[PDB]
Amino acid sequence: TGGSEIRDLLCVQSFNGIKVLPPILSESQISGYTTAATVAAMFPPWSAAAGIPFS
Amino acid sequence: GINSGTTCSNDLLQPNTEVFTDVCVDYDLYGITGQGIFKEVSAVYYNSWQNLLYD
Secondary structure, eight states: OOSOOOOOSHHHHHTTTOOOOOOSSOHHHHHHHHHHHHHHHHSSSOSTTSSSOOO | OTTOOSOOOOOSOOSOSOOOSSSOOEEOGGGOOEEOOOOOOOOOOSOSSOOOOOO
C-alpha cells in the first residue's frame, strides 16, 4: 500500500484472508541462538563440544 | 417500434466518471467487476484494440 508495482501474488493473497503471520521468534533471534551455540562450542566454557576445545 | 428495437438512447448510469487514485474506486469496465486502487502507469505498447491485461 505504500507504493510499488504489482508483480507478486502476496498482495492478492493477503487481501483475501489468506495471510502468513510471522513466527513468534524472528529469524534474527534464531540466528543469534545458533551463533551463540557455535561460539560456545569453541570458546571457553565449552558447551556444545562436551567440554573440550574444537581442535 | 415502441419498447422494441436495437438502436435507441443509452443515457443510463455507466462507470465512466473522473477516475482518480489514493482510494480503491470501484471498477466495472469491460464486463469485469472488482475492487482496487488505480495507479497511473504509462503503457503505450498496447495494441489498437487491446484494452486490458491479465496475469
